[PDB]
Design a protein around this ligand. Structure first.
Ligand SMILES: Nc1nc2cc(CC[C@H]3C[C@@H](n4ccc5c(N)ncnc54)[C@H](O)[C@@H]3O)ccc2cc1Br
Length: 625
């Protein structure tokens, strides 16, 4: 578990080199598919008629070896962007030739350089290849952290290096890649091979690149320092970066010659191995989530839908959610039933949305550990869950628990309740319609009763991730609006991304809802100070809830209830990405709207430039009442 290749520019025999390279521990080889010095003429006689074979035979390796072990490289003389027409045209033919040969072989990927600012024709020609025949090579755009013009040794007397800081100029290689990928229309098949140099840049520059589709990081031998035993290693600041890329499960490519010419070469790879297993193991959240990184799912809608047995099972595999709930009913029973009243006073607890019982068992445990007495109702509308309750009630609970098979908003109640406990909370707190449901059940709370939870708040934060943007773009479907996928929330363990500003509260709800003419609709404006240049792709959503007094739950990253994996964040995309300059404010507007059938969100960017209103009138996304 750390995937690694060798870069070479020199392969006498593809047979023997591959074997040398396997023996060193490498998983794959980046090599030329034509000789990197064999320039070719397509137009002028007599060179265009150069006889003989143009490159090596495909028969030198097994189909399987081409498809797994080999990554091809563009000849370095191919310059589709030269100022010389004649080179522009040979390079055009050269590139389609190399790209088509990579295709013939079924190479899993082919490497192309971004080594200058104008790669317009290079995009045009790659974009052309991509729309010609059926193939599916990945294209690795080799792009350095630092333009080589910006790490030249300062040794031209009449051409000094820039000794001043240019915040935006030190990011130029990100704009090289941004322009390339924008021109190629964000094709899912164009990724980054990020070249790390001897000196890192400022974190601002490295940060530009998080949220970017990084498939490979290139480590030249020449950036490794030597330790006392004589063996290659990396700076502490290079380590910080490697630890971040291993989180992006990228592939590591080792380019250049052995500069540790005492200590052998698998030494370079071994050090990567040493860093892999010398990192912190996964916490419970991370072991639960490995699989889910940047996987878009539909927000659950347990009102409009009856949930599957196996969903409830994952629900109830959260020890923190439920121990936090137990502790809150504990504290509420003590504050409601003084000691000397302990047997005179039996409190009425109504679990609203009981599912398969976990809040019942959390209510039965609390009442024990406080030594008070409770009448339980278990109100649930999903009759498949009621089969689970009515069986786990005959066999186990008593009399104590009466199962009600009803929508809480419809139920006529035998008694009023001292406490109502609910678990109707979504990733965006109110997105499963806690507010509308508990509003409808509020009439059977005693004039002085408690709701657990008592309060919840959504939070929002602008993010950049060309990765997640591309993922949302791919959810186009037959037979709906071609852009609907941008007008709906996804729940997703956001991973390859950049939070551009601190979360801020969006919508808040309190239970009970004291003040009448209730209205659960809302408009909110948020101003996000942004400190970097970037690209906005959507808004991360999180929440916090007050169950009782100081007992709370959070999926707001800065206050996240540790251990608690029930909820992943939500994501609200925007149709069109929005450039943000350092110092500019991102202004977003959220509406929560409703009729009597549906609830939905609408949303807009008003600064620095306007988006369209997303999801007007729930045309793309609604939550069923
Ligand atoms: N996003 C999440 N949402 C959760 C919701 C729940 C509660 C699901 C229950 C509530 C039931 N429900 C919903 C609306 C409703 C209603 N109006 N009357 C009765 N039962 C109702 C509904 O039928 C169902 O059995 C539990 C765990 C969750 C974990 C996550 Br992560």
């Amino acid at each position: 578990r750390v995937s690694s290749g060798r870069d070479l520019n020199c392969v006498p025999e593809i047979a023997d080199t591959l074997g040398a390279v396997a023996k060193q521990g490498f998983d794959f080889l980046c090599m030329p598919v034509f000789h990197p010095r064999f320039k070719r003429e397509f137009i002028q006689e007599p060179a265009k008629n150069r006889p003989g074979p143009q490159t090596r035979s495909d028969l030198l390796l097994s189909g399987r070896d081409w498809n797994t072990l080999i990554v091809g490289k563009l000849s370095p003389w191919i310059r589709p962007d030269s100022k010389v027409e004649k080179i522009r045209r040979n390079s055009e033919a050269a590139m389609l030739q190399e790209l088509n040969f990579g295709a013939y072989l079924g190479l899993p990927a082919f490497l192309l350089p971004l080594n200058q600012e104008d790669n317009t024709n290079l995009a045009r020609v790659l974009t052309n290849h991509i729309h010609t025949g059926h193939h599916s090579s990945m294209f690795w755009m080799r792009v350095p952290l630092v333009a080589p013009e910006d790490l030249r040794d300062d040794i031209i007397e009449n051409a000094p290096t820039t000794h001043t800081e240019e915040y935006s100029g030190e990011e130029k290689t990100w704009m090289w890649w941004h322009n390339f990928r924008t021109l190629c229309d964000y094709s899912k098949r164009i990724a980054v091979a990020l070249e790390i140099g001897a000196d890192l840049p400022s974190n601002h520059v490295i940060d530009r690149w998080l949220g970017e589709p990084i498939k490979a990081a290139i480590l030249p031998t020449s950036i490794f320092l030597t330790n006392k035993k004589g063996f290659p290693v990396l700076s502490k600041m290079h380590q910080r970066l490697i630890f971040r890329l291993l989180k992006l499960e990228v592939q590591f490519i080792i380019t250049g010659t052995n500069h540790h010419s005492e200590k052998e070469f698998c030494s370079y790879l071994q050090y990567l191995e040493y860093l892999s297993q010398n990192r912190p193991p996964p916490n419970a959240y991370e072991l639960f989530a490995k699989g889910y990184e940047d996987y878009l799912q539909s927000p659950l809608q347990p009102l409009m839908d009856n949930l599957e047995s196996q969903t409830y099972e994952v629900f109830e595999k959260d020890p923190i959610k439920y121990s936090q709930y137990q502790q809150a009913i504990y504290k509420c029973l003590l504050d409601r039933v003084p000691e000397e009243e302990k047997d005179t006073n039996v409190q009425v607890l109504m679990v609203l949305g009981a599912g398969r019982g976990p809040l019942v068992n959390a209510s039965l445990r609390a009442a024990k550990q406080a030594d008070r007495r409770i009448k339980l109702y278990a109100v649930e509308k999903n009759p498949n869950a009621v089969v689970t309750l009515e069986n786990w009630q005959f066999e186990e609970w008593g009399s104590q628990v009466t199962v009600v098979s009803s929508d809480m908003r419809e139920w006529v109640a035998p008694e009023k309740a001292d406490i109502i406990v609910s678990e109707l909370l979504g990733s965006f707190a109110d997105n499963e319609l806690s507010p509308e449901c508990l509003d409808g059940a509020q009439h059977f709370l005693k004039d002085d009763g408690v709701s657990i939870p008592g309060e919840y708040t959504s939070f929002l934060a602008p993010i950049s991730s060309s990765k997640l943007y591309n993922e949302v773009r791919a959810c186009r479907e037959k037979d709906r609006d071609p852009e609907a996928q941008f007008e709906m929330p996804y729940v997703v363990r956001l991973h390859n991304f950049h939070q551009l500003s601190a979360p801020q509260p969006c919508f808040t709800f309190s239970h009970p809802n004291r003040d009448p003419m209730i209205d659960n609709n809302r408009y909110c404006t948020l101003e996000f100070p942004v400190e970097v240049n970037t690209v906005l792709h959507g808004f991360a959503g999180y929440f916090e809830t007050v169950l009782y007094q100081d007992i709370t739950l959070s999926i707001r990253p800065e206050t996240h209830s540790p251990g608690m994996f029930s909820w992943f964040p939500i994501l609200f995309p925007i149709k069109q990405p929005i450039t943000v300059r350092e110092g500019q404010t991102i202004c977003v507007r959220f509406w929560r709207c409703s009729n009597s059938k549906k609830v939905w969100y609408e949303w807009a960017v008003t600064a620095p430039v306007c988006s369209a209103i997303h999801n007007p009138t729930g045309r793309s996304y609604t939550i069923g009442l």
